[PDB]
Amino acid sequence: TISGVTPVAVMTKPLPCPGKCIYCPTFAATPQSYTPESPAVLRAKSCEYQAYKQVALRLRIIQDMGHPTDKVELIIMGGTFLSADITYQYGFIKDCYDALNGVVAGSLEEAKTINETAQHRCVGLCIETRPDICGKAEIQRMIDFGTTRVELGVQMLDDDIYKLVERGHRVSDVAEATCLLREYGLKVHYHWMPGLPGSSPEKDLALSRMVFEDPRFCPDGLKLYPTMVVEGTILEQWWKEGRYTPYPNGTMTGLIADIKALVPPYVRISRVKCRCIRCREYSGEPTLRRLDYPASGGKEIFLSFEDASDTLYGLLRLRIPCASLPVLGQKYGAKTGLVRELHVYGTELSLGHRGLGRKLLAEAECLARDEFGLDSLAILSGVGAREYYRSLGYELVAGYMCKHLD
Ligand code: FES
Ligand SMILES: [Zn+2]
After folding, report:
1. Rounded to an integer, what is the distance from CA 6 to the centroid of its chain?
2. Cα torsion for 171, 174, 180, 181, to the nearest 10°?
3. Nearest CA to ligand 1 atom 4
4. Nearest ligand, measured from the Cα of 162
5. Ligand 1 near 278 CB (within 6 A)
6. Contact, 258 vs 203, CB < 8 A?
7. Which has the closest alpha carbon to 176: 225, 210, 134?
8. Contact residues for 126 (Cβ-Cβ < 8 A; gap 6+)
9. Fewest CB atoms within 10 A around its CB: which of 1, 29, 218, 310?
10. Which residues surround ligand 2, an ion (CB under 5 A)?
11. Which ligand is nearest to the CA of 260?
């Protein structure tokens, strides 16, 4: 009986718009502006957006619900966090880790090191960011934070469709950001919302179909935000004037269903029949399955453990990179494979049964060594999970859990 990974979602402070525009609003628009009554955003405002206080409060709430806190995924919401002052960012993350640890460390590195064997393990850290705010520097900082997953605010993959954030972004930005995120071994999720102004159900469906056929994209998951008119927002005005008309409930539901119907086996759908990862969660003993698909000039290998009824027991994402962007310093070769995710259902492995993870990793190492002739494997693990990989011969190098293939 193993306990699930509990989400700890916190928001950063209201920030000015990343771009310079006299017409732009006082503060940068967040997706959460259209989910205002969410517990986490209201909680965020009630804490004056203090990281430590938010995390401590969240931990207390989760503990009071009777839910486990031994495995935690930190989620940094806002989408504009990486555009803030550097000191603020590092101090925020450090505050989060301090709140998880129960002790105040002398630095971020010490906080992470401490969290490696703390009670509240941070087995994952997810950061929301905009496609145009996701370059090499931002990514390196995210590595410094101990980031394992990124949610890109794509919203919808078309330049002529109005976004819910100010200014907006381009498809090329999404492509570049996705490429860079993959090349650094991060998990990539897209914020996906049908019903945006200037679109149509047919267009949303077509784009939803294209996002899984074009090698530039193909995210690990979609976060479905059914677009709707929220009072106190600009969309409300757009609806008053008649400039925007939302889909009927049956239309939206049908569209969501059609979207779920066309997703590849390696995709996980979550809402803010379906044959995705989440709708196969969990007869016969599971066997090992492999599914390859091209992405960002590299190869993606989706390994999984599934039984005769196609029920999913575990999965591993192994990337054969287009280049070696992570610097690992001589000891680990010029060509290195990346394990972007290891998930033995329904949870994440942190401590150091559990055999499925070992088997998945073994197959990954085998494929990387024999078929693609790679020198080593690198795993961008959450800090609180590092120990697990340490029990399997991996050692910490520049934020990655690395092992030389032999
Ligand atoms: S209002 Fe500032 S960019 Fe559209
Ligand atoms: Zn599903």
Report:
1. 14
2. -160
3. 167
4. 1
5. no
6. no
7. 134
8. 73, 74, 75, 76, 147, 148, 149, 150, 151
9. 1
10. 269, 274, 276, 278-279
11. 2
| Ligand 1, atom 2, residue with closest C-alpha | 24
Could you identify the residue written with the tokens 């120990």? 387
| Determination approach | X-ray
DSSP SS3 for 72: strand
How far is 271 from 81, CA to CA, in rounded Å?
23
Handedness of CA 247, 253, 254, 259 (dihedral sign): positive
C-alpha 131: how far from its chain's center?
13
How many helices (DSSP H) and strands (DSSP E) are in the chain? Answer: 11, 14
User: How many residues belong to the chain?
Assistant: 406
The experimental resolution of this structure, in angstroms, equals 2.2
**Alpha-carbon dihedral sign for residues 135, 126, 380, 106:** positive
CA triple 176-179-183, angle to 5 deg: 140
Full DSSP string of 162-212: PPSSSS---HHHHHHHHHHHHHTT-EEEEEE-TT-TT--HHHHHHHHHHTT
Cite the DSSP H helix spans in 47-147. 51-65, 86-101, 108-115, 136-145
Q: Determine how β-strand 400-404 pairs with β-strand 336-344.
A: unpaired
DSSP 370: I
